[PDB]
Design a protein around this ligand. Structure first.
Ligand SMILES: O=C(O)Cc1ccccc1C(=O)Nc1ccc(-c2cc[nH]n2)cc1
Ligand SMILES: O=C(O)Cc1ccccc1C(=O)Nc1ccc(-c2cc[nH]n2)cc1
Ligand SMILES: *Cc1c(COP(=O)(O)O)cnc(C)c1O
Ligand SMILES: *Cc1c(COP(=O)(O)O)cnc(C)c1O
Ligand SMILES: [Cl-]
Ligand SMILES: [Cl-]
Lengths: 357, 359
């Protein structure tokens, strides 16, 4: 009921590509594993190459597709580490089950990914702010037009080296368009899984945001306009709450929120410091507006594998620009999180969150 | 701006497959249409042998569901003339889908001609036995070799064809049972359930398995705190009843964002409006209204509409634990039969009609 890393077939490349925008440059090899009625085949690391798909593949008709996204970091000691990969494996499997795609063993796949990165180790940059982006994918591959549980599937992993997210070597804030007409996900839906179907529909909304002079979309939900997510990031607010208490709040995992790995790590870190209240609670636009008027908001930011932490300085809501005082406040919490994550990720501090390749 | 049928290139196949017990969606004809789009605009359209697609592993079609599709039928009449049912509507709907996903625009009439040309090449695949048809499956997908979530700079439009048998075994319309569970949501206001995008279907697979597990054949998709009946499986839903105000009516949910605007659905409203024999409306329908109408003997027929079956009677709805009998079959089903008959006449050339497009 799962492929084994022990059965790995390696096929090194004939012509290695020469080393050098996110998501454009890929490495020499990829992981591929086929599944069918006779279960999982043997995993193989093969050179990077195209997929060959039947024109009726359910991956293309009915979006039987899911992905992951995580980063591997090369520290000063030249050792490569993945950040909390076990959580990505957990989330990938939940995604798989939701789309009736075949179950697999999380440790086997991780080992296969480790083996794949081992093989392309030379691709992992080591300049400040850089990393290798790891993109696993599982797709249905039924050669029929019936909307049904696939009897064929493909799991593959590709790797993309990436440069520093903040070019200045310093966090820079973003502006958000907050328009309630666009809804990313619904209770009872699939917004809490990393399914390809959740992203395609946001492309037009992101264009609307730029058209309107904003950089990303603030996803609102419900008649009370709950702040759910920022672009493809989780949202956090650092403020003095109504009851006079300083807290860090992020929306709870009630179904419309993608359970981000960084998000969970920011909650864990802040809980560990024990210096202020850390809570998972709904956040409405009205709470935010009242807190801003009353000078209670210190920092608003997104969390995700792309930037780690992204400051927010403006929200366009109801044709009205709300200034958010994040950068004015340091941004102290943001910088503290970035420094601890950086120290853990590049091996400056030992930590069980890191998985060595 | 758009590819042109004028520039069609044809590569006839040299490995024609042996023609056939037709199971929907598993048997394909010898040729396919294929047109690519990039920064230079659309390439030349081509008809070519049926073959696998080659895709970059980062293709946005597979990572961010930049994919949409259509579904329509070609019918071979008694006069052996092959005809498409209201294809212009499918073309309109496909274009709306493409725009919603920031996929490249095209000329609806040029694609239609290219499709006509393709069916003409595979004309001998069109079955002619009663209730059979040729299923047309146009697809448009983004194909950017990049993990960025953005408007693709490359896309692929293709069309494949499938011969299909009669939906109903001996021609007799056969009713279905539905699982109505509020825990399941197909689509939401502000979402994309009203476009024919691949993303709307993948999540239904697990729910359909649950319908089977619970002894039902299809899913009755409910929406909102008031349990509005929206769609039945991949079909629009219609209720024929005497409403609370004493008026005999045909009702279907309105196009308010959670309803896919079916070609058959529109055609049924057009026909029934034309007859002028009873009220025809687009209004939400709730489970509470249905239960009360069933208790009062006001329901005559409930049915789905779609390209698959045309019109599909419903005899049972399992709502939570209650098994509700729907008396569709005890009432003829008169309206269903009348729609079926009139559509068959139009579709198989028995009666020349502006709704038919000759191949
Ligand atoms: O947005 C997220 O946090 C998650 C996500 C969800 C969905 C799709 C993609 C991503 C993602 O990781 N995109 C990504 C963009 C840019 C870079 C980058 C550029 C220079 N350094 N790093 C790294 C990752
Ligand atoms: O359900 C719909 O009406 C639309 C749809 C939406 C989404 C996916 C597929 C369909 C569809 O057309 N499926 C389909 C099944 C079976 C047959 C058949 C079998 C014997 N004769 N014809 C024809 C079409
Ligand atoms: C990928 C993603 C995130 C962030 O998840 P991480 O695991 O922290 O990278 C947040 N929201 C959405 C919608 C996403 O797709
Ligand atoms: C395709 C489809 C229909 C029916 O549309 P027709 O154009 O009548 O075939 C109904 N509902 C959903 C959800 C669909 O995908
Ligand atoms: Cl962990
Ligand atoms: Cl028409």
């Amino acid at each position: 009921s799962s492929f084994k890393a022990a059965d790995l077939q390696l096929e090194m490349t004939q012509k290695p590509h020469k080393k050098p925008v996110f998501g454009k440059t890929f490495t020499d090899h990829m992981l591929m594993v086929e599944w069918n009625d006779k279960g999982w085949g043997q995993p193989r690391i093969q050179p990077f190459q195209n997929l060959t798909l039947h024109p009726a593949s359910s991956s293309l008709h009915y979006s039987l597709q899911l992905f992951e996204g995580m980063k591997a970091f090369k520290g000063k000691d030249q050792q490569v580490r993945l950040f909390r990969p076990w959580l990505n494996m957990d989330r990938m499997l939940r995604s798989a089950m939701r789309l009736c795609l075949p179950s697999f063993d999380k440790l086997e796949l991780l080992e296969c990914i480790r083996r794949l990165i081992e093989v392309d180790k030379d691709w992992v940059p080591d300049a400040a702010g850089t990393s290798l982006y790891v993109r696993p994918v599982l797709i249905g591959n039924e050669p029929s037009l019936g909307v049904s549980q696939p009897t064929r599937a493909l799991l593959f992993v590709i790797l993309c080296p990436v440069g520093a997210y903040f070019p200045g070597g310093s966090v820079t804030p973003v502006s958000l368009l907050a328009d309630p007409a666009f809804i990313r996900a619904w209770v009872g839906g699939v917004g809490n899984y990393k399914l390809g179907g959740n992203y395609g529909p946001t492309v037009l909304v992101q264009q609307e945001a730029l058209k309107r002079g904003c950089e990303q979309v603030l996803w609102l939900y419900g008649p009370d306009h709950q702040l759910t997510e920022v672009g493809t990031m989780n949202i956090f607010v650092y403020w003095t709450h109504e009851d006079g208490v300083l807290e860090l709040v992020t929306p709870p995992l009630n179904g419309v929120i993608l359970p981000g790995v960084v998000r969970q790590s920011l909650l864990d870190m802040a809980q560990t410091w024990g210096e202020f209240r850390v809570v998972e609670r709904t956040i409405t636009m009205k709470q935010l507006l009242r807190a801003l008027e009353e000078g209670r908001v210190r920092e608003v930011f997104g969390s995700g594998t792309a930037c780690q932490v992204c400051p927010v300085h403006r929200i366009l809501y109801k044709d009205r620009n709300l200034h958010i005082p994040t950068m004015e406040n340091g941004p102290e919490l943001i910088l503290r999180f970035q420094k601890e994550l950086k120290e853990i990720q590049y091996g400056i501090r030992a930590h069980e969150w890191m998985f060595p390749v």
